[PDB]
């Protein structure tokens, strides 16, 4: 009966090739990091005590915004929200949030980016069911593959290595596309643990290699 959205092993790349970046190109966005930094949260459902599934997406932000681009919301620490419920992987309304806003319908964007580190579970109760990080211009289009929308989709062994027990997830990925089009662009991780318990201690560390950034392209 369960809303569930697991994405495997898929690795989908769309747009235009990697934008030579030109005098007339514009940076609208970027984001980086000087050092790693840790998510460290407890999943759970509020409500609802059933064991056993943890279905959670992150918001994915570097710490360093470039100071001469208006702030955005890739700008800050990743930050993890749980699903609607035990049965229900959709998200309210109000987390699904863009990393950045277009005000320009005849815009067409490039973005480059690398997002390293590594997600882990805690103890030995839980692994991980399925992960995956997405860039889109809808917030969890599903299947992902069936949607142009869809701009970067990786997930499980295209994302990343595993330890032995799906404890650990360990990546590092890159996106250099251009010729997009979008209202809002979405960049997350969307996740869930399998697991004998309640409640999971979530840990994502975003390494210091990881950026994003955001060309208007010149027409």
Same mark, same amino acid.
């Given at each position: 009966?369960?809303?569930?959205?697991?994405?495997?092993?898929?690795?989908?790349?769309?747009?235009?090739?990697?934008l030579?970046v030109?005098?007339?190109d514009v940076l609208v966005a970027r984001s980086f990091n000087e050092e790693?930094?840790?998510?460290?949260?407890?999943?759970?459902?509020?409500?609802?005590?059933?064991?056993?599934?943890?279905? *959670?997406?992150?918001?994915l932000k570097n710490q360093q915004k470039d100071q001469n681009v208006a702030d955005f919301n890739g700008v800050g620490?990743?930050?993890?929200?749980?699903?609607?419920?035990?049965?229900?992987?959709?998200?309210?309304?109000?987390?699904?949030?863009?990393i950045y806003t277009?005000?320009?319908?005849?815009?067409?964007y490039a973005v480059k980016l690398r997002?390293?580190?590594?997600?882990?579970?805690?103890?030995?109760?839980?692994?991980?069911?399925?992960?995956?990080?997405?860039?889109?211009?809808? *917030?969890?289009?599903?299947?992902?593959?069936?949607?142009?929308?869809?701009?970067?989709?990786?997930?499980?062994?295209?994302?990343?290595? *595993?330890?032995?027990?799906?404890?650990?997830?360990?990546?590092?990925?890159?996106?250099?596309?251009?010729?997009?089009? *979008?209202?809002?662009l979405?960049f997350?991780?969307?996740?869930?643990?399998?697991?004998?318990?309640?409640?999971?201690?979530?840990?994502?560390?975003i390494?210091k290699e990881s950026y994003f950034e955001l060309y208007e392209?010149?027409?």
């Open positions: 009966d369960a809303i569930y959205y697991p994405v495997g092993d898929v690795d989908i790349e769309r747009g235009g090739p990697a030579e030109g005098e007339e790693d930094y840790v998510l460290d949260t407890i999943a759970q459902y509020p409500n609802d005590p059933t064991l056993g599934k943890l279905t *959670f997406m992150i918001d620490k990743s930050k993890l929200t749980m699903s609607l419920g035990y049965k229900d992987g959709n998200y309210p309304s109000e987390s699904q949030v863009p277009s005000q320009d319908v005849t815009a067409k997002l390293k580190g590594e997600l882990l579970v805690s103890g030995d109760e839980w692994m991980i069911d399925y992960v995956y990080a997405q860039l889109a211009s809808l *917030f969890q289009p599903y299947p992902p593959a069936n949607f142009p929308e869809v701009f970067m989709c990786k997930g499980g062994m295209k994302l990343g290595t *595993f330890d032995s027990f799906r404890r650990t997830c360990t990546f590092d990925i890159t996106y250099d596309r251009s010729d997009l089009s *979008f209202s809002q979405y997350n991780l969307f996740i869930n643990l399998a697991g004998q318990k309640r409640e999971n201690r979530v840990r994502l560390r390494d392209q010149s027409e």
